[PDB]
Write a protein that binds this ligand. Structure first.
Ligand SMILES: CCCCCCc1cccc(Nc2cccc(F)c2C(=O)O)c1
Length: 208
C-alpha cells in the first residue's frame, strides 16, 4: 500500500539545500521528497540486479537473505532547478522499540562509490516509536555530483547520466541483524517547471 511494512514505515524522506539567505528569510529546495504522514505495482528485482553491486550487500544477496516483502523501488523525478547547507532527512515509525542501522550506498554503473552508515535508537511519540535521522549533511560526492548535473546543457543528457546512478538503502535491526526495509532508488530529472515526484513499486521475484 505504501513504502513500509507492519514492522517499520517510512514517514518522511527528503534531500534539500538551504541557501545562505535562509537565515534572513527561510527557504529550502527539495531535490526529492516522500511524505507518508490502493496496492503498489510490482517490478521484478531481476531487471535491476545490474544497477547495484554483486557479492555482499548486492540486491541478489539481500533478496535471498529476505524477507522478500521488505523490498521497494522508488523512481524519483529530481528537481535540479535551483555554499548553502546540503542535507538529507529520514523519519521512520514502528510499534517495536529497536536500534536501527541505516546504510545508504551510491552506485555508478552498478559499482559502490560512497556509503554512509548511521545508527538511530527509538524515541517515544504518541502511541508509536519514531526514528529521527534529520538534517544529516549530504556527503561531498553527492553535493559535487548535483552541481555538475545542474550545469549540463540538456535534460536528455542529465537523464542519460542518471541512467547509471542509483542509491540502495538497507535498514536493519542493529541488535538481531534482521533486514526491516530495503529501498532501491532510480532517478530522472523533472522538467524546469515541475517539482520532485516519485513512484513507489514493490520489488518481487517469481517463486517459480
Ligand atoms: C539526482 C538527485 C540525487 C538525490 C540524492 C538524495 C539522497 C538519497 C538517499 C541518500 C542520500 N545520501 C547518501 C546516499 C548514499 C551514500 C551517502 F554517503 C549519502 C550521504 O549523503 O551521506 C542522498
Amino acid at each position: 500500500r505504501g513504502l513500509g511494512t507492519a514492522r517499520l514505515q517510512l514517514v518522511e524522506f527528503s534531500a534539500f539545500v538551504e541557501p545562505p539567505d535562509a537565515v534572513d528569510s527561510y527557504q529550502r529546495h527539495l531535490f526529492v521528497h516522500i511524505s507518508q504522514h490502493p496496492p503498489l505495482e510490482s517490478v521484478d528485482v531481476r531487471q535491476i540486479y545490474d544497477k547495484f553491486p554483486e557479492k555482499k550487500g548486492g540486491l541478489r544477496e539481500l533478496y535471498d537473505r529476505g524477507p522478500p516483502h521488505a523490498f521497494f523501488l522508488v523512481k524519483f523525478w529530481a528537481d535540479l532547478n535551483w555554499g548553502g547547507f546540503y542535507g538529507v532527512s529520514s523519519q521512520y515509525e514502528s510499534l517495536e522499540h529497536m536500534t536501527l542501522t541505516c546504510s545508504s550506498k551510491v552506485c555508478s554503473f552498478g559499482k559502490q562509490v560512497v556509503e554512509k552508515v548511521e545508527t538511530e535508537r527509538a524515541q517515544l511519540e504518541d502511541g508509536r516509536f519514531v526514528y529521527r535521522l534529520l538534517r544529516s549533511p549530504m556527503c561531498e560526492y553527492l553535493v559535487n555530483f548535483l552541481h555538475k548535473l545542474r550545469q549540463l546543457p540538456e535534460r536528455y543528457m542529465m537523464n542519460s547520466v542518471l541512467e547509471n546512478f542509483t542509491i540502495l538503502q538497507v535498514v536493519t535491526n542493529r541488535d538481531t541483524q534482521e533486514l526491516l526495509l530495503c529501498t532501491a532508488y532510480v532517478f530522472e530529472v523533472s522538467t524546469s517547471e515541475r517539482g520532485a515526484q516519485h513512484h513507489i513499486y514493490r520489488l518481487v521475484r517469481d517463486v517459480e
